[PDB]
Amino acid sequence: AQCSVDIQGNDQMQFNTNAITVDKSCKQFTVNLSHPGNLPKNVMGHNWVLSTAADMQGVVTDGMASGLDKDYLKPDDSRVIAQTKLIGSGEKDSVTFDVSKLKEGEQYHFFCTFPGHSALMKGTLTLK
């Protein structure tokens, strides 16, 4: 069984997927984020952040207020189920999280919190 996904965030402010499914039989799930392109992190940095859909807008708003020095994520945000760091182009970051943290009968979204990106870089995450 597959318990990981590889996702690209590129210089056109896009994730290459907007829907991720996690098999409920995985104990852990790994997101491998890569950022192809040629822009530095301070122009077009991308992260991958998972929260409930109801928490998403707040996560994003608080992350932009947190600023570039904090990867545009509030530190220790307890609305964040899992996150990569912010990466510039040519970089990669993976996050692994326990599938036991997703609730059956909750809605989840992933997104990038770099300012403005979540209009395009957002998607759903579901248990299969």
Ligand SMILES: [Cu+2]
């Ligand atoms: Cu981004």
